[PDB]
Design an enzyme around this catalytic site. Structure first.
Site, short mmCIF file in Angstrom:
data_model
loop_
_atom_site.label_atom_id
_atom_site.label_comp_id
_atom_site.label_asym_id
_atom_site.label_seq_id
_atom_site.Cartn_x
_atom_site.Cartn_y
_atom_site.Cartn_z
N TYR A 1 17.32 32.05 -8.93
CA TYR A 1 18.33 33.02 -8.52
C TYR A 1 18.71 33.94 -9.69
O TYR A 1 18.75 33.52 -10.86
CB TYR A 1 19.58 32.31 -8.02
CG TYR A 1 19.41 31.66 -6.66
CD1 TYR A 1 19.12 32.43 -5.55
CD2 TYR A 1 19.54 30.27 -6.50
CE1 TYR A 1 18.96 31.85 -4.31
CE2 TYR A 1 19.38 29.68 -5.24
CZ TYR A 1 19.08 30.49 -4.17
OH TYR A 1 18.95 29.94 -2.92
N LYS B 1 38.88 3.59 -15.24
CA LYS B 1 39.20 4.75 -14.37
C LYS B 1 37.94 5.57 -14.10
O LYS B 1 37.03 5.50 -14.85
CB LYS B 1 40.33 5.57 -14.99
CG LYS B 1 39.93 6.35 -16.23
CD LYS B 1 41.13 6.88 -16.97
CE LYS B 1 40.93 7.82 -18.12
NZ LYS B 1 41.97 7.65 -19.19
N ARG C 1 52.80 14.05 -20.52
CA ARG C 1 52.04 13.80 -19.28
C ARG C 1 52.73 12.77 -18.38
O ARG C 1 53.40 13.15 -17.53
CB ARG C 1 50.65 13.28 -19.69
CG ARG C 1 49.65 13.22 -18.54
CD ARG C 1 48.22 13.04 -19.04
NE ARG C 1 48.06 11.73 -19.65
CZ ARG C 1 46.92 11.12 -19.89
NH1 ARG C 1 45.78 11.72 -19.66
NH2 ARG C 1 46.90 9.92 -20.41
CL LIG Z 1 50.43 9.34 -21.11
#
Ligand SMILES: [Cl-]
Ligand SMILES: Cc1ncc(COP(=O)(O)O)c(C=O)c1O
Ligand SMILES: Cc1ncc(COP(=O)(O)O)c(C=O)c1O
Ligand SMILES: [Cl-]
Lengths: 388, 386
Positions: free
Chosen positions: B276, B51, B150
């Site tokens: 900055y 991923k 989740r």
């Molecule tokens: Cl999960």
């Protein structure tokens, strides 16, 4: 920075397939440019600063507006950005707004970039590149009167003054601009440093036998251009305000919205933990919305247990720490929520809006730290209004 | 996430136009995989989690190593990742490790991805896609025994158990896996939750008339696979440790280095401000190195006045807040520094190395928040060793 900017602009079907995305308001960008113009003296030139792929908003999608607005100059940072500008058809002045390595400068010759130099070695290297390409390279000299201590030559000592004259007198080089840049939003400070800049620029042009009429003097970023008008000089360099990110001047709204969708709705009993570290535990029977956005898309871990998102026109709390790819939101008391509904992470939805100050406070970042990385990590979709 | 994962790998000529870039160690990746394998039991198998474009390291440049190592399964999050995995030639099992919208799932039918479902509506939606596509779609059921709250179905109540049975009994669907995931690096908490997962999985398979022999039970991330070996079950799901990001198991070095170059060297007198908000003022006559990297490349603003970088093998302090595109470094006392020299922002240079702990302390982020965005914002170059 990316080595190449995707030539194709994503279309609607590609959006229905994206996990998260940016919506860029072309009408808001146009309105901001026109409002900015209203405060500029007529013969002050505008250099639109487009670094970091137009502040995350995308050079390729915004250049037709820059061209349509008759902007004569564009500033960029990377070679890929310079290429995207030229591939838009832009035939105006193209400047680099940072120091760039010799590697970078040499590989960019066909893009006709005006480089920004503040050291003798940069001047020597470009003079040699000029003699090798049979061109006269155009450069801007960065002076340190603003006190950025960054790309410029400091002239407060004898040695610095001597180095500045050596920069300004190299063979096969055309000095077309002299500039500085300011670090703070304080009008009294900019006026004092502007006066020093006028003195140092005048001295340098005299010592180096430069012709005033061939030099563009420029010092103003968005803040300075609007809040210290005497600093407009020959050209201004607005970036942030065009994109609607100037904190002193909220009358330019942001052109970007960051969006995701509800993937799935999960029922969780009281006393259930959520997320890594179990930093949140339900206090009641809950309905949680699972969103396929996370910190890998630029929605930070710190948003969890602090931020709200907009779903079906209502504010909903982000619960648990953000995962790499997924965010969980408490929709227990939000009516009408269904999988597939649009979620606004930053921006407006119906009457509610997630403010820049919320983002900054929740993420513990300044706004451009968020949106520049939103732009490298999500597709951009361009919206424009028309009359029916 | 990106809509498309660039098909071409940057070549040698391209690094001259790069302001900043990542160098990915293919040899370190191979050695992390081989070391991980040495701790796995004979009966488990590996699903490499790739991923966020392989944790910022790049799916297209790492998939040859995954195929050479005989890894039978890969996990991804986005459709673009699934497409890059299949375009690499990978012909194994491909799973999604997160809930995905119907429009995402529908767009991905040609990729042969096994979706991860934890709600009745996901099961209903996939069943309808199966009917419309004329196929039987393979799915993994996510359970909430680990307590992530989740992607899974919680089964601690009768409502949850009934929803779980509905998910597992949908026609035109083939349940090929049952999984959970753990939120903490507490081995004792993992063991307690593993026992509960065995109960819940076994109950679900009985009540939905699933055949154990046809189901892959999988619960272990990097940490769990190495530190609770009884949780390896039929398949493990390592991500971070393969790439050298498992904080508990420091024996897997990171495969990524982040680099730039010195663009210019500037003489600045004592009592000069930098950057900055003028957060730094020189205390001596100085020589500053100007680097063409900033927070838009993923080097955060907070690095200024805290971090060090490596130049010509020596540590050098970053001074002033990091601009969008430029960083300034104090090289007054660093010998031998010249324009064009390589700068290491994270990684090793000669004997010194900028540690993960320095990045996290200086940035006020966890390491993957940095490296996943490095990977979307900079080109990746792949180092290979004979
Ligand atoms: Cl999960
Ligand atoms: C030298 C320089 N000029 C102008 C700008 C634009 O600044 P702002 O976004 O504050 O208008 C930046 C960026 C910059 O670095
Ligand atoms: C469901 C799931 N499994 C496995 C992994 C890999 O986790 P780690 O990087 O801790 O090994 C992740 C990512 C995940 O979300
Ligand atoms: Cl500057």
């Amino acid at each position: 920075a990316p080595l190449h900017i995707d030539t194709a602009l994503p279309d609607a079907a590609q959006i229905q397939q994206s996990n998260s995305w940016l919506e860029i308001s072309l009408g808001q960008f146009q309105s901001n440019i026109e409002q900015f113009k209203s405060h500029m003296n007529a013969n002050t030139k505008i250099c639109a600063i487009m670094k970091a792929d137009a502040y995350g908003n995308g050079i390729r999608g915004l250049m037709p507006t820059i061209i349509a607005q008759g902007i004569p100059c564009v500033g960029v940072a990377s070679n890929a950005e310079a290429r995207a500008v030229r591939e838009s058809g832009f035939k105006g002045e193209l400047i680099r707004v940072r120091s760039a390595s010799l590697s970078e400068m040499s590989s960019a010759l066909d893009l006709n970039i005006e480089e920004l130099i503040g050291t003798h070695q940069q001047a020597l290297d470009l003079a040699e590149l000029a003699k090798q390409s049979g061109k006269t390279l155009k450069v801007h000299i960065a002076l340190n009167d603003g006190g950025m201590g960054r790309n410029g030559i400091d002239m407060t000592t004898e040695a610095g003054k001597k180095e500045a004259v050596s920069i300004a007198t190299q063979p096969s080089l055309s000095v077309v601009g002299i500039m500085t840049h300011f670090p703070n939003y304080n009008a009294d400070e900019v006026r004092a440093k502007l006066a020093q800049f006028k003195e140092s620029s005048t001295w340098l042009m005299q010592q180096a036998n430069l012709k005033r009429e061939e030099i563009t003097l420029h010092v103003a970023n968005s803040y300075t251009a609007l809040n210290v008008p005497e600093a407009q000089l020959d050209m201004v360099r607005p970036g942030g305000v065009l994109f609607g990110d100037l904190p002193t001047n909220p009358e330019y709204p942001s052109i970007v919205s960051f969006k995701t969708r509800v993937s799935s709705l999960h029922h969780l009993p009281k006393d259930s933990t959520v997320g890594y570290d179990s930093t949140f535990t339900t206090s009641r029977d809950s309905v949680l919305a699972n969103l396929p956005v996370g910190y890998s898309d630029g929605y930070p871990r710190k948003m969890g247990n602090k931020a709200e998102v907009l779903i079906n026109g209502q504010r909903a709390k982000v619960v648990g720490v953000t995962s790499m790819n997924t965010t969980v939101v408490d929709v227990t008391e939000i009516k009408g929520v269904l999988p597939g509904q649009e979620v606004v992470l930053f921006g407006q939805q119906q009457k509610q809006s997630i403010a820049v100050s919320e983002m900054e406070n929740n993420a513990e970042l300044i706004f451009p730290e968020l949106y520049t990385l939103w732009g490298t990590s999500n597709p951009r979709f361009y919206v424009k209004e028309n009359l029916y």
